[PDB]
Amino acid sequence: SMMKWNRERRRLQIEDFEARIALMPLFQAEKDRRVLQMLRENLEEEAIIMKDVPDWKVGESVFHTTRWVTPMMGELYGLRTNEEILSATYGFIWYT
Amino acid sequence: WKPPPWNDVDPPKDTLVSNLTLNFGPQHPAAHGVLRLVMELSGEMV
Amino acid sequence: MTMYIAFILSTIFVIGFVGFSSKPSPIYGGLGLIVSGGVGCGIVLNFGGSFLGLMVFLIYLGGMLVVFGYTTAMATEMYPEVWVSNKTVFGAFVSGLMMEFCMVYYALKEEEVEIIFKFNGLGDWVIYDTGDSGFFSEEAMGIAALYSYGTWLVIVTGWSLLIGVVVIMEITRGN
Amino acid sequence: MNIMLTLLTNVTLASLLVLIAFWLPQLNAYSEKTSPYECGFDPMGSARLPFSMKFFLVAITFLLFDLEIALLLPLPWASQTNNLKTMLTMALFLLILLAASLAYEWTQKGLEWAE
Amino acid sequence: MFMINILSLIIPILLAVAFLTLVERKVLGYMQLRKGPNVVGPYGLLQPIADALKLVTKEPLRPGTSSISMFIIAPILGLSLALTMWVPLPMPYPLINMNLGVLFMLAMSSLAVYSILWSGWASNSKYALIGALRAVAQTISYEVTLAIILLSVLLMNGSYTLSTLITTQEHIWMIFTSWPLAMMWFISTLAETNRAPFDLTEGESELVSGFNVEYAAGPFAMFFMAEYANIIMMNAFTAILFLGASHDPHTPELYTINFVLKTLALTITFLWIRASYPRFRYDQLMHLLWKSFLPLTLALCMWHISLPIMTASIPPQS
Amino acid sequence: MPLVYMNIIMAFAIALAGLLMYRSHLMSSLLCLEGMMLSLFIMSTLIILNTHFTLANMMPIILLVFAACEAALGLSLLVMVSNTYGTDYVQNLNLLQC
Amino acid sequence: PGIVELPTLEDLKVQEVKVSSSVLKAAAHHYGAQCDKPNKEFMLCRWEEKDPRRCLEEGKLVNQCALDFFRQIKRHCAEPFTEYWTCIDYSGLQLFRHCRKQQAKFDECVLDKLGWVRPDLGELSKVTKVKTDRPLPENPYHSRARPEPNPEAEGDLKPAKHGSRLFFWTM
Amino acid sequence: AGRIASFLKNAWAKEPVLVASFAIGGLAIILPSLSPYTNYAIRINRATPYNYPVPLRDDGNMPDVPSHPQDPQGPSLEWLKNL
Amino acid sequence: MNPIIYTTLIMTVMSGTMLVMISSHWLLIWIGFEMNLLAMIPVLMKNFNPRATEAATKYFLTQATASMMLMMAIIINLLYSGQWTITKMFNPVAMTMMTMALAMKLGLSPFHFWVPEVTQGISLQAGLLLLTWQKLAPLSVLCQISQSINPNLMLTMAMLSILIGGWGGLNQTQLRKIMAYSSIAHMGWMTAVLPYNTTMTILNLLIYITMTLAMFMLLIHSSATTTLSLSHTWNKMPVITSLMMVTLLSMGGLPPLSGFMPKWMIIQEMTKNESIIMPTLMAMTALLNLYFYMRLAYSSSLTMFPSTNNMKMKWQFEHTKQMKLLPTMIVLSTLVLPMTPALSSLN
Amino acid sequence: PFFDVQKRLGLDLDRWMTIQSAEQPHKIPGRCHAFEKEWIECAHGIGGIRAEKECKIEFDDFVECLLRQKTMKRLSAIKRQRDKLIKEGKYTPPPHHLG
Ligand SMILES: CCCCCCCCCCCCCCCCCC(=O)OC[C@H](COP(=O)([O-])OCC[N+](C)(C)C)OC(=O)CCCCCCCCCCCCCCCCC
Numbered sequence A: 001s002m003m004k005w006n007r008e009r010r011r012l013q014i015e016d017f018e019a020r021i022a023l024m025p026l027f028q029a030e031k032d033r034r035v036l037q038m039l040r041e042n043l044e045e046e047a048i049i050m051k052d053v054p055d056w057k058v059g060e061s062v063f064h065t066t067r068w069v070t071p072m073m074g075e076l077y078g079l080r081t082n083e084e085i086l087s088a089t090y091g092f093i094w095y096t
Numbered sequence B: 001w002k003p004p005p006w007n008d009v010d011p012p013k014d015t016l017v018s019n020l021t022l023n024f025g026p027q028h029p030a031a032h033g034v035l036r037l038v039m040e041l042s043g044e045m046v
Numbered sequence C: 001m002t003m004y005i006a007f008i009l010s011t012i013f014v015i016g017f018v019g020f021s022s023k024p025s026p027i028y029g030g031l032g033l034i035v036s037g038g039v040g041c042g043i044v045l046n047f048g049g050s051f052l053g054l055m056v057f058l059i060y061l062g063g064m065l066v067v068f069g070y071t072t073a074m075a076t077e078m079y080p081e082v083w084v085s086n087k088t089v090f091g092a093f094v095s096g097l098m099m100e101f102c103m104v105y106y107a108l109k110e111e112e113v114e115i116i117f118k119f120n121g122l123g124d125w126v127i128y129d130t131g132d133s134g135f136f137s138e139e140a141m142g143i144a145a146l147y148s149y150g151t152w153l154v155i156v157t158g159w160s161l162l163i164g165v166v167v168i169m170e171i172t173r174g175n
Numbered sequence D: 001m002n003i004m005l006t007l008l009t010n011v012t013l014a015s016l017l018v019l020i021a022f023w024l025p026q027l028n029a030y031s032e033k034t035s036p037y038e039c040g041f042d043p044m045g046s047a048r049l050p051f052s053m054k055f056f057l058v059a060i061t062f063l064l065f066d067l068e069i070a071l072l073l074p075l076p077w078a079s080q081t082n083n084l085k086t087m088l089t090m091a092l093f094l095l096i097l098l099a100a101s102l103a104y105e106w107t108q109k110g111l112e113w114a115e
Numbered sequence E: 001m002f003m004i005n006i007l008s009l010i011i012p013i014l015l016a017v018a019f020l021t022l023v024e025r026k027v028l029g030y031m032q033l034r035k036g037p038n039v040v041g042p043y044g045l046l047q048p049i050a051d052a053l054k055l056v057t058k059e060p061l062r063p064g065t066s067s068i069s070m071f072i073i074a075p076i077l078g079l080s081l082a083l084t085m086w087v088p089l090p091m092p093y094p095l096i097n098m099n100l101g102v103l104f105m106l107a108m109s110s111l112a113v114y115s116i117l118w119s120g121w122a123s124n125s126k127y128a129l130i131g132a133l134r135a136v137a138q139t140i141s142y143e144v145t146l147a148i149i150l151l152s153v154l155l156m157n158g159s160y161t162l163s164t165l166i167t168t169q170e171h172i173w174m175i176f177t178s179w180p181l182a183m184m185w186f187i188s189t190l191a192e193t194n195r196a197p198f199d200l201t202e203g204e205s206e207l208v209s210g211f212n213v214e215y216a217a218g219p220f221a222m223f224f225m226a227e228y229a230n231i232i233m234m235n236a237f238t239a240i241l242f243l244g245a246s247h248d249p250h251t252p253e254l255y256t257i258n259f260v261l262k263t264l265a266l267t268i269t270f271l272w273i274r275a276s277y278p279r280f281r282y283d284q285l286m287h288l289l290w291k292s293f294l295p296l297t298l299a300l301c302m303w304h305i306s307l308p309i310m311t312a313s314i315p316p317q318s
Numbered sequence F: 001m002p003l004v005y006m007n008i009i010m011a012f013a014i015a016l017a018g019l020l021m022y023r024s025h026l027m028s029s030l031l032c033l034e035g036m037m038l039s040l041f042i043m044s045t046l047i048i049l050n051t052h053f054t055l056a057n058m059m060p061i062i063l064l065v066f067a068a069c070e071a072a073l074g075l076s077l078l079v080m081v082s083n084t085y086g087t088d089y090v091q092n093l094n095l096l097q098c
Numbered sequence G: 001p002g003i004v005e006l007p008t009l010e011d012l013k014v015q016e017v018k019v020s021s022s023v024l025k026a027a028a029h030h031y032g033a034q035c036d037k038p039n040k041e042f043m044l045c046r047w048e049e050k051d052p053r054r055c056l057e058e059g060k061l062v063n064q065c066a067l068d069f070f071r072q073i074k075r076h077c078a079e080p081f082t083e084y085w086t087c088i089d090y091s092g093l094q095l096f097r098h099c100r101k102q103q104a105k106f107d108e109c110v111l112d113k114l115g116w117v118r119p120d121l122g123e124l125s126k127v128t129k130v131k132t133d134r135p136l137p138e139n140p141y142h143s144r145a146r147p148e149p150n151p152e153a154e155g156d157l158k159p160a161k162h163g164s165r166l167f168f169w170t171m
Numbered sequence H: 001a002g003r004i005a006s007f008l009k010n011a012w013a014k015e016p017v018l019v020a021s022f023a024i025g026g027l028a029i030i031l032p033s034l035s036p037y038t039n040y041a042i043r044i045n046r047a048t049p050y051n052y053p054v055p056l057r058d059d060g061n062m063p064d065v066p067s068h069p070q071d072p073q074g075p076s077l078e079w080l081k082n083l
Numbered sequence I: 001m002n003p004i005i006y007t008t009l010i011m012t013v014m015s016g017t018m019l020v021m022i023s024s025h026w027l028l029i030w031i032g033f034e035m036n037l038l039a040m041i042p043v044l045m046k047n048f049n050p051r052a053t054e055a056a057t058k059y060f061l062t063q064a065t066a067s068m069m070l071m072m073a074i075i076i077n078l079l080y081s082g083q084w085t086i087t088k089m090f091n092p093v094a095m096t097m098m099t100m101a102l103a104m105k106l107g108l109s110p111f112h113f114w115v116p117e118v119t120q121g122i123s124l125q126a127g128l129l130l131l132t133w134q135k136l137a138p139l140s141v142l143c144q145i146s147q148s149i150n151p152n153l154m155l156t157m158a159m160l161s162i163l164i165g166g167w168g169g170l171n172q173t174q175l176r177k178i179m180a181y182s183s184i185a186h187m188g189w190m191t192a193v194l195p196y197n198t199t200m201t202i203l204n205l206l207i208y209i210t211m212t213l214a215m216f217m218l219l220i221h222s223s224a225t226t227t228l229s230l231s232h233t234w235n236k237m238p239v240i241t242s243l244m245m246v247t248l249l250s251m252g253g254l255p256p257l258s259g260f261m262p263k264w265m266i267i268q269e270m271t272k273n274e275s276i277i278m279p280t281l282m283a284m285t286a287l288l289n290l291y292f293y294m295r296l297a298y299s300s301s302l303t304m305f306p307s308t309n310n311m312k313m314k315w316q317f318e319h320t321k322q323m324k325l326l327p328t329m330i331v332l333s334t335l336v337l338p339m340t341p342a343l344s345s346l347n
Numbered sequence J: 001p002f003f004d005v006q007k008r009l010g011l012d013l014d015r016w017m018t019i020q021s022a023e024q025p026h027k028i029p030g031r032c033h034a035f036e037k038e039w040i041e042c043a044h045g046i047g048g049i050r051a052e053k054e055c056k057i058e059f060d061d062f063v064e065c066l067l068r069q070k071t072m073k074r075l076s077a078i079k080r081q082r083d084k085l086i087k088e089g090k091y092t093p094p095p096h097h098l099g
């Protein structure tokens, strides 16, 4: 009985997984727009605040290469609230 | 300083074990209330 | 607060370490160490290392240190050497509470602490990476590779453990 | 958020529950009342002596045994690997060596610990 | 409103534990053809209240040769851990849905031995000292079988998520697949929880009162409350593990009926065993575990790891 | 480098000092030794979890199961010393000398 | 050492789908196979171009191609959608197993209303060839020039001149 | 022969435990090789799509890969639902 | 200990050292060190005397500490580079960290304090294993990571090794303590050349291996542990004392004996590396080893110490040992200088 | 290794795990897969001495990828000046900062 039930669950899992596969396009596009838009907000905020710094020209590439690097979470959410920081870093981690 | 013993078996000191005289009873429920059974034990072994 | 929560858990980890490192009573040293053992798991949990975090609870808190209590119950030096018994242990405990209090303040002010290594005192949350793990827990898939790619480690770890039991009985047999 | 909050609540619940179990009953202990109870007779001065080897021997065997079982927690996710045959062989190895360690320990007295 | 739910979980259990003394007293008496508490209130219903508030009003004598800080920390750990044991339980929808709840379950259960070791050392008496040392020695011997049993049992479940156990047993009880392990798991739970024949930890007849040989009044209830709380939780843990129940999402009421009714049946058979068997002995206590239990657990674990592969019945990890 | 990494690194260093700065109980010494590895076990998890070195999640257990093995040796030697000498003192554990 | 070039917020003001998760999950199977062509084009760009900023044009297309998928079902039996995604929403894990009747009712329309078909198991997980016009990136990692390997050994081995040549040893 | 049957039966007279465990462990290792479902087990295990099957650049002359997740081309698992 | 158990214990110790020399992964390097340690203690426990228990306890504490300290060098290198490959590592503090971690295993610097005492407590056969085979594993790591070493830090550790190792040797009666002090002195010679050219670090190893096998198994054949006990062996078997004085002279490094070959090549290398003060001082301290070498040679065979009437039984009987590989050991350990240019085979 | 037996007989014992850009379970990446792959292919068939200086660019970039020192210092200086300015009330964070 269990081997039939377990076999059924595997069919259910791959069916559930297949839904996620179809859901990746919209999700990837939405996260793609969100992450770089929010980076631009950071860069815009950098160029209202670093104007008086003796040596600060905005948009410095800390990495020497021109290849895109996935944005580290520090420069992403660093200029947000405490709720945004907490709900993003450990939001999944806590979630009892 | 003393040169080491030739057999390398340095002499064992005094006994470092005891037989743990235990005063079983009388308040002990197993002691029937009035037993002063006192035994010698090497661990659980008596 | 929750801004620098992992700053906290790391701090009790240090003071917990200073506890037993100050050479207090072996049970009390065990108490201080398991306190560090308990708080250290939270540090790993905050990073998503649930499986690794839960293990140290299992095989290090409920594992090694339990049989440590046996030797403490076996040693039983004629008097407890709890913190009040000696004054050097107080000095060791008191001292170990200073420099880590010094450098956190050093790191909290300008963050340019250069003890041995250069170190940033910025919030713990920063170094985290952003990205979904899908359905596969990265911690789980890593450990489960024990039987996929960690074949060679499995043999050596198993063989040493087998040799681990042959030595223990042989040394303890007392000829 | 909730996890240590749940941990926090229990500890306070325990501490107050012993706190009102400690100050409330109006502690009135005397010297003989606090004296150790030894089956109703005089204690001769003890609980500071080593206990041979059997209790220690089983503890180490348990510790070694606990370490091997630690190696085999990840089996439920291990079954989800792509190469089962390697995983099946490898997991069987840990169990049979766990058996072998028990097998030797049994044969050379061992679990029949000292007396 | 997460807070009120927490008190909605810990408060009923404490009152459940108090009433567990009454029912056990009556049921054990009934095996002995006695009646059990029936004078204090209707059918002894207020006996738990009478016992609870009498002990609270009794002075908590500390022994002369005791470390007071050491004497007090042990009940705090013992009682808090016992109440924390229920936070990942799959009760309708689990409170703390820890994806590794079973590991969290085992780690906390294994951490309970520190109360046993610390209570024996803090009491500082030979009778309490060897009572505790054998108590943990009995304790530390068996959870290796606990871990092995769970690893074999959970192998066909899919993961360590306690909520997943419900969907695995959606058709038949999981005992039918692993009834050799079911009795294997059941007996080991008595040894962990220290009931007869595995009562040599306490040994009322021959070890006076074990680690509670001195422990009196105020904080004695903590070990007693923690002990009896573990009895429900271990039986509750067995109830979900092997005697699973159907759970309709639109009526979690029904599965609570099944889970609750099973877990009193599992607690009832606990003291049912107590009222029938002689107390074991330290050497048999180890010999039974290490000679006839460990080998059987190993083989059954070997049987249950390979079983999904030879039947292509591996469970989804989700 | 993040502030937390100091806390484990300094935890090891003070644990290292306790292992070397002795007293009269090598039982207490073994505690610093296993605490020593606990920081090693703890810290190793941070980098590996942080950097997503998935196959490297291996070694925190591997380091554990081998550091735990030394406890078997160390504690076994403890009772061996506590049998020819009875106690776990370290000043008396100087019979070699010459 | 350069500019982290970021697109202006102007091109980021693309229409975004406003639907709860269960709405996506309920129609996910009937969404993947019927909007595959733009989805594959965008995600091919994500893995080939390897840079988020390159696939902005396709990023709004899939979002747009989601909306015209999420509009005709309104001009068709949106009512079976309601309880179906409602029932899926009730599930904690959004499991399809409990709510299959409403799935059948939802599937019954799209077989005739728009004439869609339920994709079979494994079909969505099939690797598909996407036909695009964009050129493949030359160096997606923006690799620099590579150091020239040191010249290899060549020529036949000859006997060591005058033996070992170590102090007085002749051979 | 005579000794083996006597020894096995005689062993089952004193200890029934280890002979039971040895028999179970003995079974636990052989039939995994002899089972016909292990190949099925790895097939369904490979069939689970944890990651996205990233599309392949269509440049012509790979007929095996479908152009749509409904075409007959590509891998199919009609055995799985029957299995 | 059961011979089958003893054989397995040695087998793992050999494999653990073999594991270290064959691992490209830092974790496996540690695995070999610990499991070699895990089986070293019981061999020292074979005799099971209170002196041995003191010796084994001392050996385990220092080796476990060094191995545990070795982990951070791996972890810190991991932290700053994310590379488990055993290669030129990328952190001066990590490079410094392991160098003393491995040095404690070898016992060169004040770290060397465990080396003499452990040898004194444990049996002659166990001392032979400890001072010869247990030195390959720590050396294997140093050879691979030689390119990353700070020259000043390693040369110093080598210096105090020969310096103190030779200096205290003048004040040792027990032959076991003499051998260990010789071992520490020889440890410096190989370690000094290690940063410059690893080829003759190995050459010193096999050569230094040869005498220590030669000397210890000669001592085992003599069944003597003290200078006076060694002296009486002239009466029983004068021939053995004759070969021992050849090896004693050879291990001292007098030409044309084999022991001169390492030192000569070592001086040649650092002289090529412009370091010319450093070789000179070690050569001066080399005579320090030669002194108590001569003192043993004076007591063993060059003179004729008084014997005891109870020696007469020893004449009547004979040795039952087989001293495997002893014949070829001393010959390969006393006259191989003409075959010096064979060191290119190591390269 | 000292004796590269792995290379001789060609059985992979440990090198499957020595670096993070190799085969990984479920083909999921490390944090710095892109960088270390670049550094590895830069420093192949070159030698330790030459690869120390020639492939320096790929190294410190990769080191910065996983350490993230200067990036974190960049954020720290950004944050430090922010509180050194907004506390003086010179510039007010826009609503998207606070949501
Ligand atoms: C294809 C088939 C695959 C599977 C096949 C498996 C083999 C066939 C089935 C075998 C039996 C099941 C597995 C073994 C179980 C027994 C293990 C064992 O060691 O037994 C002998 C053991 C030991 O017996 P012993 O000590 O007399 O003898 C053992 C052997 N010597 C002498 C050599 C040591 O029995 C016990 O331990 C007795 C019970 C002790 C605990 C006291 C309380 C008992 C309460 C019983 C009633 C409640 C039961 C609740 C069940 C669960 C409910 C949820």
Ligand SMILES: CCCCCCCCCCCCCCCCCC(=O)OC[C@H](COP(=O)(O)OCCN)OC(=O)CCCCCCCCCCCCCCCCC
Pocket: I237, I238, I239, I240, I241, I242, I245, I246, I301, I302
């Ligand atoms: C580089 C510088 C030199 C370095 C080495 C120096 C070594 C000696 C230094 C001094 C040592 C201390 C002082 C002397 C100690 C003597 C030790 C001893 O045991 O002496 C007595 C002993 C008695 O002799 P016995 O053992 O009975 O054997 C006789 C021969 N059967 O005597 C013996 O046991 C000695 C036995 C010697 C046997 C010699 C056999 C020679 C065979 C030659 C064959 C030649 C073949 C030529 C072929 C030519 C054609 C190819």
